[model samples]
Structures are given as C-alpha cells and as structure tokens.
Target: LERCEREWHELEGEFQELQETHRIYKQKLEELAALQTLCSSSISKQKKHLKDLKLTLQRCKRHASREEAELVQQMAANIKERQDVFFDMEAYLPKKNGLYLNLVLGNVNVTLLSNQAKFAYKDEYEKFKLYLTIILLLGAVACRFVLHYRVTDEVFNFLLVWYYCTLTIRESILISNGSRIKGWWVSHHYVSTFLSGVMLTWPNGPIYQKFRNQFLAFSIFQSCVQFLQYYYQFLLPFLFCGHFWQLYNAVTLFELSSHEECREWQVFVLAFTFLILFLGNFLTTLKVVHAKL
Candidate 1:
C-alpha cells in the first residue's frame, strides 16, 4: 500500500502545478469581465450626454427656451474655439498623404513621429538652401567671369535644375509631415523646378548666347538676396524688388522673342513664365503687406 501511494505522488504534484496556472487564468478573466462592465457603463453615460445635446439643439432650432439657447450659444463658441485649436494642433498629428506623396512613397510612412525629428529635418532643409546658395553664387562667378566655355553654362543650369528639383521634393515631404507652409510657397518651388528644367533643355545656339550672361547676373543677385532672407525681417520688401528684376528680365526676353535672331519657343515660353511668376510674387507681396497692416 505504501509503494502504491508513493507511485501516485508524482501525479499529485503535476495536478498541483496545473491548478496554480488555472487560478491565474481565472483571475485574468475575472479582471476582463470587470473591465467590460466599467466600459459599458462609461459608454452609456456618453450616449446619454450626446442625446441630451441633440435634444437641446432641437429645442433651440424649433422653439427656443432662452435657457436652452444660452447653453447652446456658449457651447457653440466653445466648440468653434476647439475646432480652431484642432486645426493648428494638426502639426502634431498624422496627416493624410497628398497626391505627390502617394506617387513618390506610396503607402510607406515618412512621418517624423517626434518633434525632434521634425525639427532636425527642418534644420537640414534650411542648411541645404544656404549651402546651395553659396554654391550657386560661386558657380555663377566661375562661369561668368572666369570660364566662358559653353560647357560651364550647361553645368550651372544643371545645378539649378537639380537644386530646385530637390527643393520641391523636400518641401513636399516637409509639408506632408505637418509643416504649415503657404500653398503658393510650396508651388513656387515647383515653378522654379520647371523653369530650371526648361533652361537645361534649351539647345546651345544663338538663343543660349542671348541669355547666357543675363542668367549669371540674375543668379548673382538672387543668391545675394536669398542670403539676406536669413537676417531680414524686411524680407518681403527685398523679395518684391528681386522679383521686380525678374519682371524686367521677362520684358527683355519678350523683346528677344520678337528679334529676327530668335526662333525657339523656349525663349517665348520662359519669358511668359517669368512674367507669371513676377505677377504671382507681386500679388502675394501685396497680400502679405495687407495682412501685416
């Protein structure tokens, strides 16, 4: 009898272990059930609050008790303020992807996810602009003053195309990731990219020669003014003058298109495009000024 009881002792130990695990599992289920009850009660309270709000709204809409109207008016403004806050707070929230993003990145997430990452990217963007401005200025000087070779011109225009293309892509990513940029400012980079693309494609001939030195001079001033943008709170005034120069460039090119030596469509197209950009610049400046006032 002693041997038989000893033989069953191992089985008893296994049962004890199993029962301990079962106790823990039952405790977890009991907690889940408690949570369900709590959640349902909270949900019911929320539903009742919503029903009361709707009923009050209907009363005001049909036949207002002054008390009901007062409650709604206060709540309406509170909601209005809350809505405005929500829009501004969107910078901290995940945003829907734009069409451009969908094309470039598809469903892959480019979200920075944290304030530090977003700030870092913005700093990089600013540093890139400054670095390129310096490079563009130096390139213009080399091509215009030192190297008169046609190949030099091609290199500079290539840089312009590359730089503007990068800016558009980077800015689009920044905006999609919660940067609050003006819509026109974002589109401005696209137009610049297109303009530089046209410049890159322009065949070297009489037309290229016509605009060669002029393009370099514009770059010299543009780079100089772009640097000033970093320090100048009076940025728009200077920009207004800079784009005024663009308008002048367009006027001169418009004359080029009419010249007997001019036959290429790029000549006329770039001119009109320059005109449109300056007009946009001018109108946007006025709007900024009006707002500032």
Candidate 2:
C-alpha cells in the first residue's frame, strides 16, 4: 500500500511541473505578441514619415523650378530696362535751337523723350503720312484721268524727291527722340532718296516712256501700302510686296535691256539699289516676325 501511494505522489508532482512549464510558455507567447505589435507600429510610423519626406521633396523641387524661372524673367526685364539708358541724352538739350545746333556742331544726342512727347511725335508723323497718302492718291487719280504723261511724270518725280527727303528728316528725328526705329528703315529711306534722284535726272527717252505707266502704278501701290502701314501696323505684307516688286523690276530691267544698256552706270546703280533694298526689307521683315514669335 505504501509503494502505491508513493507512485501516485510522483505522478502528481509531474503534473504540477507540466502546469508550471505551460504557464511559462503562455507568458513568453504574450511577450512575443506585444513585441510584434510594437514593431508593426514603428514600421507604420516610419512608412508615413518616408511618404511625407517624398512629398516635401517634390514640393521643394517645384518651388525651386518656379523661382528659377522667375529669376530668369527678372534678369531679362532688367536687361531690357538698361537699354532705356540710350535715350537719356536729349533731356539736357534746349528744345528748339538745340537740335539745329547739335546738327551743325555734329553732336550726337540720345536723350529719352517723355511718353507724352513720344506720343505727340507719333501722332504728328501719322498725320504727315496720312497727308502724303491723300496727296499721292489724288495725284495718281489726276495722272490716270486728266494729266498728260509728261506732266504726270514731272510732278511724280518732284513729289518723290520731296517725300524721300521728308522721310529721311523725320526718321532722323524719331531715332534721336528715342523711337526704336530699325536701322534698316533709315537705310531704306536713303535708298529711296538715291532712286528718286536717279529717276529725276533720267533723260526723256524710249526707256522712260516704256516704264512710265508701270512706275506710276507702282507709286500708287506704294502709297496705298504706306497708308495701311500707318493705320494697321501690319508691315509684313507691304514689306514682302515691296521686296518682290523690286525683284521683278530688277529682273525685267536685266532681261529686256541690251548689254550696253545694262552696263550703263546709272542702270547698274538702280539694279544694285533695288537688290539691296529687297534684301534689307526681307531681312527686316523676318526679324520683326521672329521677335513676335
């Protein structure tokens, strides 16, 4: 009986030990679960921080690009404003006699004019152009209807000389007054002056009679073009047409005239003048168009 009782006691002890081990295992499992929860939360927080950093970096790059663009634009504006300094010299001179004295003394003044003065000059120029257009239109009508060819030719030659001289003077004033008139425009006036001078000196001959009507038509066309340019500022069409018209005249003169006629100094001068005028007009128009683009 005693032996049996001892065996039972041993079994009980073994059971108790198993229960203790089970309790220890359970506690360890709970600890492991808590650690897992902590690690998962940390990982989530790190992911959110990483996402926020990426967004901030993206915003910073965008802001940097915008700032760079603004800086470049500001620099361009500053450069353009600096160009205004070229017009500052006219402010120091006397209003009326200073221009004449400056011219006589070979002084080059580049004073920037007031906006009001600039606008006034622009209006005056427009008026002058309009008056010339009217005169030319009336002259063309008279020539077409009433005037004899010789009378028309003489009047036209006189008008051309007067007009070109006026253009040269006006363009000079505009340039001096801070108008951003292109150099080619002044050069064009000079060429026109030379052409008109040559035409005025051209002798009455078969060639003159042959080209008279065409010249009159061209004059009328040019007058119309001037009127358009004055009001609309659409220069491209007029420039293109003017250049092609000169080209056509050059080709015609070369083709129809005999070698001796072509070799004449006056004829060569006219041909070269027309060629240069055409090229200048073409290039100026291209530049204006490029600037707009």
Candidate 3:
C-alpha cells in the first residue's frame, strides 16, 4: 500500500510539470503573434508616408510650372502693347498747335542744359533744398519713434497722431481744391502732373532729364498717396471696431458694449463695400488723369 502511494505521488509530479510546459508554450505563441502584428503596422505606416511625399513633390512641381507660364505670358503681352502705343504717338503728335501741344504733351527736349543757362546758383539751391527735405523727414520719423517708445498709452498716442495727420492732410486738400476752383494752376499741379509722367518714361534721356522727370513723377505720386491716406481716417474707427471680434480673445468691446450678444448673419458687408467703391472711384479718377498725362 506504501509503494502504491509513492507511485501516485510521482504521477502527480509529472502531470504538474506537463501543465507548466503547456502554459509557457501558449504565452510564447501569444508574444510572437503580437510582435508580428506590430511589424506589419509599422511597414504599412512607412509605405503611406512615402506615397504622401511623392504626391507633395508632384504638387510643388506643378505649381512652379504654372507660375512660370503665367509670368511669361504677361511679359509678352505688355511688350506688344507698348510697341503699338509708341508708333501711334509718333504719328499723331504733329497735328495740333505745335508749341501748345508740345508743352501739354511734355515734349521738352532732352538735351543737357549748361549750368550758366539755368537759374543762377541752381545746383547750390537744389542741394540745399534736398538737404532741408531730408532733415525734415528725418525729424518727423525720429519724433514718432521716440513717442512710441516712451508712451505707455499706445492707443491714445496712435489716435492722437492719426488725428494730427488727418487734420494736416485735410488742410492741404482744402488749399489744393480752393486753388483749383479759383483757376489758379499752381506749379504744384504742373510739377506733380509732369513728374508722374517721368515715372512711366523708359530708355530715353541724359541722366539730368531722367532725374528731373523722376522727381516730378514722385511729387505727383506722393500728392495722390497723401490724399488717399487722409481719406482712410474716416473709415479707420469702424475697422478698429471690427477688430475686437477675433475668436482668440473672450473679452472685447463687442462683449463690453453688450450684456448679451450673438454673431450676426452677413452683417455690414454691402455698406462697407459701397463705401470702399465710392472712395476707390475718386482714387481711380486721379489715377486716370495721371495715366493720360
């Protein structure tokens, strides 16, 4: 009976060992399956990235080609139009009262004038004028820069400067308009108009002629620019009002101005567009006059 018990104990020990081995084998099979799945997933992601890179490269190349083609086409058209206008001008210029027409057309000779033939001390005076202009411009720039650096009240400072600039421009515009209404064609008008023409002229002149023309052109351009700049004053407050509505900030004037508010459906676009068009029409007319000159 004791021998039978020992044999039973040995059988039980062998069964336990077999169970342990089966458990280890099953665990290893599970680990192998998991590893295989991970490797397959990694390979699939790499292939997708490669496909995306190829598509991006193709898109970039296509965009570059389209830009290049459009640029070339625009250049060719401009050249053709310029040639046609040049030939027509050569033919049509002689039919009017020659001196009057020539003056109106800016057909002044490009020959270099001697210093003695020009106003006495013209070069000296011009150098002084240029120096004075530069000094004044620099002074204005410096004052603005310093004020911005020192002022804690930036919004107030901005409004103050804007108001001053607007006032100055308004006064200038009034003066210009009054002069025109009284039939006074000041050198300011002629000089500005003539200067703008010089900006469009190309490939023709002694350096002095080019310089004179360029200066005149800049004067005209600057007058128009100044006029438009002042015009923006009236519209700036509304634009500032609109700027308060960005999504990033929770607290703003839109909220401050209201106890409860919701976003509008298509608010104010038409009125704003009409205002812009009206302003633009005046600027456009000014531009056309410059063009005809």
Candidate 4:
C-alpha cells in the first residue's frame, strides 16, 4: 500500500508539470498570434500612407505643371506686346518725312510743341493760306480791271510763280505735319505753272487782243467764285459754277473768237485743259466732302 501511494503522488506531480508546460505553451501561442495581428495592421497602415503620399505627389506635379504653363503664357504675352510696339514703329517710319525728319527739319519743332500748340499752329497756317489767297485775288482783279495796262501778262506770271512756289512748300510742310492734301491739287499747281509758261510766251497781237478781254473776265469771275467759296465754306455751288464757267469759256472761244486769230487747235487745247481742271477740282471736292461726312 505504501509503494502504491508513492507511485500515485509521483503521477500527480508529473501531471501538474505537464499542465504547467501546456499553459506556458498556450500563452506563447497567444502572444505570437497578437504579434502577427499587430504586424498585419502596421503593414496595412504603411500601404495606405504610401498610397496617400503617391496621390499627394501626383497632385503637386499637376499643380506645378499648371503654374509653369501659366507663367510661360504670361511671358509669351509680354513678348508679343513688345513685338507689337516695334512693329508699330516700323510701320510709322516709312511715311513721307517721317516723325524723325519732321522733328529735325520742320519750322515748328513738333517734338517740342504740345498738342494744343500744334493745333493752333496748323490753324494759323490755314489762316495764312486764306489771307494769301485773298490778297492774290484782289491783286489779280485790280491788275485786270483798274490798271487796264497790258499788265495782265506780267501780273499773272508773277502770281503764278509765287503761287506755285507757295503751294509746293505749303504742301510739303502740311504733309510732314500730318495734314494730307489731295494729290490732284498738287498736280493742278504744276499744270498751272506750265500753262502760265505758255501764256507768258504768247506774242502780243490780234490773238492776245481777242482773248485778252475773255481771259480777264474769266479771271475776275474765278476770283470772285473762290472768294465766295472760301467765305461760305460751301463747295457745291462753286463747283457747279466753275464747271459752267469752263463750259462758257469753251463755247465763247469756239464761237466768238475769229478763226484766223485763234487757231482751232488752240481753242480746243484750252477748252480741254479747262474741262480737265474742272473735273479734277470736282473730284477732289467730292473726296473732301465724303471724308468729312
């Protein structure tokens, strides 16, 4: 019985030891499982953070690209604006007596003048032309009507020369100062010069006697018409009168003048020249009126 009791106690001791070993093993297994779960959660969190970082990097890249494009566009716009300024300069340089020459050679240094002063100068110049026209008209009328001397040739020649020079210089100055007159008007002055040259060479005789009265009457009427036109600033009536005046002269030259004294060819040439002058003046007036409108 004693041996049996001792064996039972040994068995119990062995069983307790096995139970302690099993409990220790179970605890270790549980700890290992918890560690594995923790590792899995850490890996998931890292992956999520990495994904967020990638998304943020993508957004930053997109924002940087947009900013770069906008900056490039802005720079291009500035470059284009500057280029336009240069292009405008190039375009302005080729005009007759361009700003550079005008500033250097013009009587009134436009560069030094204010806008109002420039306008006043232009107005004064217009008044000067008007005054000159009036003076010349009066002089021509006096020479024809009051003098009665064969002073028509001398007076008209002088007037023509003076007018031609004045017109040329005035036109040049006006063009340089940005006032453009009609090209035909300038051409008319040149044609008048040629006509005057021809008239001055004409021999004083029967031909002159026959045409002399007619020419003087025409000049007087023309001067009166011009005075009225300038005073009224209305072109239509004067233009019509001028046309009729040329027609009347043509008819008178053809019919009233003796064929022997005034050759048919001479009458025809004078008539055609007057008609051409009338047409040119009419066209120029029309252009002026149209531009004003």
RMSD of each: 10.5, 34.1, 34.0, 38.7
Using TM-score as the measure, the top candidate is 1
Model 4, span 1-293: residue lDDT tens: 99999999999999999999999999999997797677557556755765675565455444457777686567556656755664444333323354434554664433212446547766776677677777777766666676765665676677767776676666665555544564887778777666555555555666766776666667776667766665654557767777677777767765644556546444455555666777787778777789989
Between prediction 1 and prediction 2, the one with superior TM-score is 1
Ranking by TM-score: 1, 2, 4, 3
Give me the displacement of residue 286 in model 4, in angstroms.
4.3
Candidate 3: tens digits of C-alpha lDDT, residues 155-256? 332433443343333333333222122222232333323322322332322432323322333233333444444444233333232222211122321242
Candidate 2 residue pairs in backbone clash: 87-111, 87-112, 89-110, 89-111, 90-111
| C-alpha lDDT score of every prediction, in listed order | 0.77, 0.69, 0.40, 0.64
Global lDDT of model 1? 0.77
Can you give the lDDT of residue 180 in candidate 1? 69
**Per-residue error (Å), model 2, residue 212:** 1.3
Q: Which parts of model 4 are misplaced by more than 4 Å?
A: 1-114, 232-234, 254-258, 261-271, 286-293
Q: Write the per-residue lDDT of candidate 2 for residues 1-293, one digit (tens) a residue.
A: 99999999998999999999999999999997797677557556755765675565445444457777686567556544543542243333323323433675366543434778777887888898899888978887568667766766677778978887787777667766654575787768878878877766666667766656666666777888788887774567776877788788777665545644334455556666667877887887788789988
Cα-lDDT of candidate 2:
0.69
Considering every candidate listed, which one attains the maximal lDDT?
1
Candidate 4 Cα deviation (angstroms), residue 59: 43
